[PDB]
Amino acid sequence: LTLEDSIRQNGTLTLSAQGAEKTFKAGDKDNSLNTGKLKNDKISRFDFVQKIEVDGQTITLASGEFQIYKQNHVVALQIEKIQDSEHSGKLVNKRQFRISGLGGEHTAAFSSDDPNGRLHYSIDFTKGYGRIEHLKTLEVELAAAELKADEKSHAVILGDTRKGSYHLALFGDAGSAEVKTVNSIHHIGIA
């Protein structure tokens, strides 16, 4: 509903689609979105622009696609244009995939340009192993582990990837996975 981790440098977030643009400014509680009001079990894509103001002028830090997955209770940011403030000083066309979402958590699928992904995982309360397929990457397995509040007051899987790292958060009555292949380190999500 409210995504504060998707904002950069305490700036703005202009998501724009269908001839409408809403700017979520950080530091204000009025920013909100659909708590599953958009279609569930479907990736809804938005065009986002991250901006800050320096000495009375707005500067775009990044832009690209912004996709969400809806359930009863994962935000993904496909950057297409980011700034090289360290070397070039120019807004380059560098493409990078990230995950910056969370929802309503309880207390106790997609990848880069690959919308058709299946998340088939199971876990039993022994104290989370899962298999992920239907992707460009050949053969990825989530490694089972224990769960705890971990100071987040919510159960967290904090599993691994098979040499990897995965994180799945329980909700209801949602996750992100990092994998490293030979070609590049691919970012995968769980839903």
């Epitope: 320096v54 002028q57 700034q83 000083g89 807004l91």
Partner: antibody, heavy 122, light 113 residues
Framework: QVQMQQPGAELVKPGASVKLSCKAS????????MHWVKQRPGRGLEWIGR????????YYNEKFKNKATLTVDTPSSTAYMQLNSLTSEDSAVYYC???????????????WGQGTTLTVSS | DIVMTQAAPSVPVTPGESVSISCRSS???????????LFWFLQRPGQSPQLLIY???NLASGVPDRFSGSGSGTSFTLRISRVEAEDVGVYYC?????????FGGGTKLEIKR
């Protein structure tokens, strides 16, 4: 307002070293790179190098690799430039200029220091 | 290094007419992002260079409407629609697409009166 103060002139003996300063005021100093430009007497503007007070990186012109040394002090909002083993061909005017680290602004080379007239002679 | 050439060393003009100052590059100053990184500068005698045109065509804050910017890849021109006497000075083009940033030679505006 944005003001960049440079010493009017500086005389030194040949073979010595000099550290030119360029103070800054009126803008978020860490967000802007600092470029240095030499204009010799007669004609010609040479770009020397840029220094980033945020990243600490210096990009330099190879012609001034062993001639120029760029340092910055963010607290004092001043950038420095040390010239080394000075010869007669270094008698020139040296400018500083701000350059926002971000693309898409009107804040690149839009404010220039008044210049430092460096005369090197015995 | 990119080589900026200003073929005209000086151009004469009578007050009220139009002037064109040109500048050529060794390589296209168009980046893949589509932005052409070219600046136009005016250096008045005994003064620091002053930004006139940015992004090859966009006028800079404080620059009079008389000044105009145009260009392509490897070809760029600055235009003064009606030249006044305050426009006397040397005009410098400059690339900032690649290090080292390089200036042009400079074209002096001469006023025939």
């Amino acid at each position: 307002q944005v003001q960049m103060q440079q010493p009017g002139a500086e005389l030194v003996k040949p073979g010595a070293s000099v550290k030119l300063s360029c103070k800054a005021s009126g803008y978020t100093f860490i967000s802007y790179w600092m470029h240095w430009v030499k204009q010799r007497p007669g004609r010609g503007l040479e770009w020397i190098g840029r220094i980033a007070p945020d990243t600490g990186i210096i990009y330099y012109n190879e012609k001034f690799k062993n001639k120029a040394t760029l340092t910055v002090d963010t607290p004092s909002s001043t950038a420095y430039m040390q010239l080394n083993s000075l010869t007669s061909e270094d008698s020139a005017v040296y400018y500083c200029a701000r350059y926002l680290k971000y693309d898409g602004s009107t804040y690149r080379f839009d404010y220039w220091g008044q210049g430092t007239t460096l005369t090197v002679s015995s | 290094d990119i080589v900026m050439t200003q073929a005209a060393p000086s151009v004469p003009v009578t007050p009220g007419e139009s002037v064109s100052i040109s500048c050529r590059s060794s390589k296209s100053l168009l980046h893949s992002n589509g932005n052409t990184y070219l600046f136009w500068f005016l250096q008045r005698p005994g003064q620091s260079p002053q930004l006139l045109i940015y992004r090859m065509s966009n006028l800079a804050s404080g620059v009079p409407d008389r000044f105009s910017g145009s260009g392509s890849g490897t070809s760029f021109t600055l235009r003064i629609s009606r030249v006044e006497a305050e426009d006397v000075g040397v005009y410098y083009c400059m690339q900032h697409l690649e290090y080292p940033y390089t200036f042009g030679g400079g074209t002096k505006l001469e006023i025939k009166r």
